[PDB]
Structure 1
Amino acid sequence: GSGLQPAVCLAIRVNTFLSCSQYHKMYRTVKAITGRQIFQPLHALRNAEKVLLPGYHPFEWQPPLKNVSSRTDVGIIDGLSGLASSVDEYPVDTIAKRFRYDSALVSALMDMEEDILEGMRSQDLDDYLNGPFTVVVKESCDGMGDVSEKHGSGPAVPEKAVRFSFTVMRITIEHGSQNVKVFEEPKPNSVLCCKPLCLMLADESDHETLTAILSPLIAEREAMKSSELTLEMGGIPRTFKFIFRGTGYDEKLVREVEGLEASGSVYICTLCDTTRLEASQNLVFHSITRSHAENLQRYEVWRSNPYHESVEELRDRVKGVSAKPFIETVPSIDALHCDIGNAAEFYKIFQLEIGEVYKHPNASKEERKRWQATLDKHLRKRMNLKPIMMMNGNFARKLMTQETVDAVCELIPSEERHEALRELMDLYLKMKPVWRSSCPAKECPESLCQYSFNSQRFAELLSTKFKYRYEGKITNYFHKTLAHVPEIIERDGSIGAWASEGNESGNKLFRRFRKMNARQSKCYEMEDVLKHHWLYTSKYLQKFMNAHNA
């Protein structure tokens, strides 16, 4: 058996995206050309998966998890969670397959076991320790589309998916002295780290379905919040505290799950209880107050109306919390979608400056379209940016460039507008590193140190030279970028680190697998995609694939 071990053949099948079918082609090809089993056959790879999938590593929660089965052998269970897909009940157009969040976290830890010990060593600590860790977990839910429903027996699932996925961001054990980072995901927004936890064939807007599928995960999360995980690793019974930080949500999704009105609401932030008006007036001095506890208290105020206020007075009392939060999201900023929305607003700004609406407030819809097409043709000519329908982050960070503003200026016959746009983008690029860094304390401390001032300049610039488009109407993401990013860094140390960029990047893999690494049946697509996406995110296999360096 001078070939490979099954787990390494699995790491290859996975990180190289090889399907079990194509991997089998390769394995039999090498086994028939060389004769020897260089690669291990598929049954061996599946026996290895069984180890990397949840439901293998035993574990215990010193306070047993309330409403969570103590069984340590449950892997890809149904996300419906016994949801009666009966005809008398609410319909279930949902193929949901999930790992049990505790089993999942156990597998994620035992997967990075080697890395945790590596850090405990590199952190001048004893890699035999069992001290109480603190695993910070960026739970990241995101809705997906164009998820082509498959033919075949199964519910009439929508062409939408929801990918809940927790990224083990950092593990810090307290060595008496202080919580030292025995592990920190260097690439936190990576697709290799946001470990899937629940693949729904649902719509993130379908609160009924979404909640039916997630309330299990939410129960497990609220339980692990109140229980240690004395799972054994490195031969020792380590014990982990879990700090789940639900920041990898689209703002739309946060508002869905934190009980807030849509993004267009007058109440604009998922962080502060401010209005789009107060946010276009102040734009900076806004303190984070919106918390899941506060959102729940405010929904109970709404529901109860203990002060018997009209819907307006009430909605103000609760500051937009009409719905009940069922996900404890931490008030933060999806750096991915902050960048996308800010680049969309800068794209609109370019359209407008091309229209000089600072002079011509009124404007024709077809003339706004003409400005859009002019900007499109230019960005294609100068910045080589094809005109995209739906703003993405790549188009954004190619648009959030002084070069794109140089190009746009060619279309602005107004040098004062040139300067306004160039200063605006200078500030936005002196700020974007901060809410877009995985670690601005070191990646861009020059900016973070001057973020509040740069954002004050950006705000007063929107109020001086982009007076249009920003008097009583500032985008939610502009408000977040300007007002909260400093506080989000003082609280979490980073923002990009805590973005859905990982979950979304993993939607690419969801599709890749559903098409190339899953059984093409509604009964088995989510199970298989979840299995394989987990494997992909397994630091064990990623190690075995980093062995060229190791």
Structure 2
Amino acid sequence: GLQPAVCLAIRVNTFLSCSQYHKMYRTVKAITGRQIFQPLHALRNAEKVLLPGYHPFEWQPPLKNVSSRTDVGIIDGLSGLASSVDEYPVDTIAKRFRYDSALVSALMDMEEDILEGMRSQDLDDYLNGPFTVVVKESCDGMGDVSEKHGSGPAVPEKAVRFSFTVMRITIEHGSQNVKVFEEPKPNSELCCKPLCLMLADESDHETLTAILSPLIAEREAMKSSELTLEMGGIPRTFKFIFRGTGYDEKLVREVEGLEASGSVYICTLCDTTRLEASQNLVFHSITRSHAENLQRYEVWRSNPYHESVEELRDRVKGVSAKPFIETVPSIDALHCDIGNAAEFYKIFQLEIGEVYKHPNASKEERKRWQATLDKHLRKRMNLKPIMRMNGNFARKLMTQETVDAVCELIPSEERHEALRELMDLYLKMKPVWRSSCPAKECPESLCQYSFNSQRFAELLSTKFKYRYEGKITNYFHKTLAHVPEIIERDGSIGAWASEGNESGNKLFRRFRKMNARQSKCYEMEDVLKHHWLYTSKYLQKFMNAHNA
């Protein structure tokens, strides 16, 4: 005996396609003689409960511009966009859920953990007090996604994924809010529920807006409302406080209405010129918001003070487009680490070439330096040369042994000491913006942060002025300035990182190849459904049922 739910959990979690599962079931049944595994149709029937559009729910007050039906599943991402010849050409296949249905399905799946945590917090398991659900949104733009032969629109070779993850649930049982659930691994791919999958270029602003507008409309509609849902008997009420902090820097620039990623304004958190950032490096403040960006765009369009182009650009600091997604200003840990690793790699390249003294940069010497650095790194730290910069190279490059090996190629000893001190300061600052709870895991490092940042800035301005005099990278500016304020505001930076969505990209790329139909009108639907089934805690609980 083996239940259909358990069979589905095994099949989904152990990366088995339907054909492979059918072969396994057929062989087991034929050889043993008893039906250990349930049939594929039974599994498909049993997989409908977990998917969206099955449980009844109510919204009080009723959602504005959103239908009241509670039986809607996978729907077309175009949202009825006109495909007529006369109108704007449409070359994009997209599939998405409804946001409210996805949230209600996620809450129904998490029901068991919610009740278990409520019991563990010494609270009676029948309260209907208004909860508070925190969901982090992520939007990522992939590349090198090959198109398929067949009839249909000439879709591009890049995809866009929009997903959400439930981070925290709190309930009021007095003068304080008690937490009943918290994700143990926020960046794990096992908790990143896809919501929309489209095949369109990230920089294709028109198509991106046309596809993603309904989701933003739903999110704005249900920011101020309550959701009543029957959970474990009693109906209970939930509230939602969305927090989108998973986008990368370029996508934040594109959706927040800011200018191109290369300009005189180089921060999505504050409004500071590159020269001012380079000359200050320490003291700033967070003074940017979605409503402020909307007002800035309105000022830019209306030109109320009748100013020229330069004066107008100074007045509206970088905003030249109307924002359409409300993103909380945040620092992405993964991309910050990647950028810092690339910066330190270039710093090592310069240092091993004696730029401070006798900087006779030769067209051949500039490549000799890179070649010798790459060979030395391969021989000592076992790192191969890579064109781009990824996370593992960053982690293996920021280690102290990397600087110890690089110092063998620098003739001077003062440069050795300066580089070692800089690397030590960076490594002391890193665990503050990467941990899931800085106030409890690295309290000394969290407290001793302003002094370390000031020393880092002073060293970078004194002993490395040959590169940073009127020029500081955006990630360096963010790390030096807005780490403590953002930690105080949110609680932990890194728990809201984009690692979950990046791993969901890998899961998407695997499923599109070996877990879905190969047609052009069904691949996105099948991939979305299988991904949602994969990120189900009810199914994942069986795989860990061995130990209790």
Asked if these proteins are the same fold (TM beyond 0.5), I'd say: yes
Any conservation in 2 of the 1:144–1:162 contact (CA below 8 Å)?
Answer: yes
Distance 2:460 2:111 in 1: 49
Partners of 2:342 and 2:104 in 1: CA distance = 40
Structure 1 residue 22 displacement after superposition: 1.7
Q: Where does residue 104 of structure 1 map in the other structure? A: 102
Partners of 1:362 and 1:87 in 2: how far apart?
60
Please give the alpha-carbon distance, in whole angstroms, between the structure 2 residues aligned to 1:487 and 1:50: 45
Contact 1:192 1:536 in 2 (8 A): yes
- Mapped contact 1:79–1:95 kept (Cα < 8 A): yes
Structure 1 residue aligned with 2:195: 197
CA distance in 2, matches of 1:35, 1:276: 74
Q: Could you tell me how far apart the structure 2 residues matched to 1:365 and 1:95 are?
A: 47
220 and 363 in structure 1: CA distance in 2 versus 1, 3 angstrom threshold: farther
**Residues 453 and 365 (structure 1), Cα distance of their counterparts in 2 relative to 1, 3 Å cut:** farther
Q: Secondary structure at the match of 2:352?
A: helix
1:465–1:103 distance in 2 versus 1, CA, 3 Å: same
Against the structure 1 CA distance between its residues 305 and 12, is the aligned structure 2 distance closer, same or farther, given a 3 Å change threshold? Answer: farther
1:35–1:180 Cα change, 3 Å? same
User: Is the alpha carbon distance of 1:85 and 1:447 closer, same or farther for their aligned partners in structure 2, counting shifts above 3 Å?
Assistant: farther
Change (3 A) 1:62 1:153: same
Change (3 A) 1:16 1:368: farther
- In structure 2, distance between residues paired with 1:71 and 1:405: 61
Which stretch shows the higher mean deviation, 352-361 or 256-265? 352-361
Contact 1:376 1:386 in 2 (8 A): yes
**Cα gap change, 1:312/1:362 in structure 2, threshold over 3 Å: closer, same or farther?**
farther
Match of residue 121 from structure 1: 119
Which of 533, 546, 549 aligns to 2:531? It is 533
Q: 1:418 to 1:40 in 2, by over 3 A?
A: farther
Alignment of 1:482-501 (within 5 A): 482-501=480-499
Cα distance, 1:21–1:457 mapped onto 2, change above 3 Å: farther
Shift of 1:534: 1.2
Partner SS state of residue 78, structure 2: coil
Report how far residue 199 of structure 1 moved: 0.9
Classify the secondary structure of the residue corresponding to 1:190.
Answer: coil
SS of structure 1 residue aligned to 2:542: helix
Identify the range of structure 1 (405-414 vs 502-511) with the bigger mean alpha-carbon deviation.
405-414
Partner Cα separation in structure 2 for residue 435 and residue 364 of structure 1: 39
Shift of 1:358: 3.0
Structure 1 position 253, deviation (Å): 0.5
Q: Does 1:11 align with 2:9?
A: yes
Secondary structure, in 3 states, of the residue corresponding to 2:258?
coil
Distance 1:376 1:39 in 2: 53
SS in 1 for 2:159: strand
Q: In structure 1, how many angstroms separate the alpha carbons of the residues matched to 2:104 and 2:360?
A: 59
Q: 1:188 aligns with which of 182, 186, 189?
A: 186
How far is 1:395 from its partner? 1.0
The change in CA–CA distance for 1:413 and 1:300 in structure 2 (over 3 A counts) is same
What residue in structure 1 maps to residue 364 of structure 2? 366
Contact 1:138 1:169 in 2 (8 A): yes
Shift of the 55–397 alpha-carbon distance from structure 1 to 2, 3 Å rule, reads same
Q: Which residue of 2 aligns with 1:264?
A: 262
Separation in 2, partners of 1:174, 1:415 = 60
- Alignment CA distance shift 1:231-1:265 (3 Å): farther
Residues 313-354 of structure 1: CA deviation (Å, up to 9, x unaligned): 222222111111111110001111111111111111111112
Distance 2:136 2:470 in 1: 33
Matches of 2:272 and 2:35, distance apart in 1: 64
Task: For 1:297 and 1:60, locate their aligned partners in 2 and report how far apart those are by CA, in whole Å.
Answer: 35
Task: Among all aligned residue pairs of Structure 1 and Structure 2, give the percentage whose two residues are the same amino acid.
Answer: 100
Q: CA deviation at 1:360?
A: 5.0
Preserved contact between residue 195 and residue 534 of structure 1 (Cα < 8 Å)? yes
Q: For residues 545 and 375 of structure 1, do their structure 2 counterparts lie closer, same or farther at Cα, with a shift above 3 Å needed?
A: same
Q: Is the 8 A contact 1:139 1:166 kept in 2?
A: yes
Q: Secondary structure at the match of 2:315?
A: helix
Q: Rate the CA distance shift 1:153–1:126 in 2: closer, same or farther, 3 A.
A: farther
State the shift of 1:364 in Å.
4.1
Mean Cα deviation higher: 228-237 or 485-494? 228-237
Contact 1:263 1:476 (8 Å CA) reproduced: no
Q: Per the alignment, do residues 29 and 225 of structure 1 end up closer, same or farther by CA in structure 2, a change over 3 Å counting?
A: same
Residues 241-273 of structure 1: per-residue CA shift (max 9 Å, x gap): 111111110111100111112322211111111
Secondary structure of the residue aligned to 1:280 is helix
Task: Give, in whole Å, the separation in 1 of the partners of 2:406 and 2:527.
Answer: 43
CA distance in 2, matches of 1:68, 1:93: 26
Tell me if structure 2 keeps the 8 A contact 1:98–1:197.
yes
Larger Rg: 2
Secondary structure of the 1:391 match is coil
Give yes or no for contact 1:378–1:408 (8 Å, CA) kept in 2: yes
TM-aligned CA deviation for residue 366 of structure 1:
4.7
Secondary structure of 2:96's counterpart equals strand
CA distance in 1 between counterparts of 2:502 and 2:427 reads 23
The answer to whether the 8 A contact 1:169-1:184 is kept is: yes
Looking at structure 2, the residues matched to 468 and 443 of structure 1 have their Cα atoms a distance apart, in angstroms, of 37
C-alpha displacement of 1:362: 6.1
1: CA distance, partners of 2:244 / 2:30: 49
CA distance in 2, matches of 1:361, 1:51: 68
CA contact (8 A) 1:361 1:468 kept: no
> Structure 2 vs 1, CA of residues 221 and 548 (structure 1 numbering), >3 Å: closer, same or farther?
same
| Closer/same/farther in 2, CA of residues 311 and 14 from structure 1, 3 Å limit | farther
Q: Which residue of 2 aligns with 1:480?
A: 478
* Cα distance change, pair 61–469 in 1 and its aligned pair in 2 (3 A): farther
Query: Does structure 2 retain, via aligned residues, the 8 Å contact 1:258–1:328?
Result: yes
Secondary structure of the residue aligned to 1:436 is coil
Question: What is the Cα deviation at residue 365 of structure 1?
Answer: 5.2
> Whole-Å Cα distance in 1 between the matches of residues 184 and 37 of structure 2?
30
Q: 1:323 to 1:360 in 2, by over 3 A?
A: farther
Q: 1:217 to 1:463 in 2, by over 3 A?
A: same
**TM-score, normalised on structure 2?**
0.96
Query: Aligned with 2:244: secondary structure?
Result: coil
Partners in 2 of 1:386 and 1:377 — Cα distance?
A: 8
Contact 1:227–1:241 (8 Å) recurs in 2 = yes
Q: Which TM-score applies when normalising by structure 1?
A: 0.96
Aligned-partner Cα distance in 2 for 1:529–1:319 = 41
Distance in 1 (alpha carbons) for counterparts of 2:36 and 2:348 = 57
- Distance, in Å, in 1 between the alignment partners of 2:182 and 2:127 is 18
**SS of 1:498's equivalent?**
coil
Can you list the C-alpha shifts for 1:400-432, whole angstroms capped at 9, x where unaligned?
A: 211222122222222222222222222222222
Label 1:74 to 1:369 Cα distance change in 2 as closer, same or farther (>3 A).
Answer: farther
In the alignment, the residues of structure 1 paired with residue 410 and residue 519 of structure 2 have an alpha-carbon distance, to the nearest angstrom, of: 53
| Count of residues in Structure 1 that have an aligned counterpart in Structure 2 | 548
Q: CA deviation at 1:361?
A: 5.2
- Label 1:386 to 1:464 Cα distance change in 2 as closer, same or farther (>3 A): same
Residues 355-406 of structure 1, C-alpha deviations (whole Å, 9 max, x = no match)? 2323355634553333223222222222211111111111111112112221
Residue by residue, what CA displacement relative to the aligned partner does 1:483-524 show, whole Å, maximum 9, x if unpaired? 111111111111111111110111000101001111112211
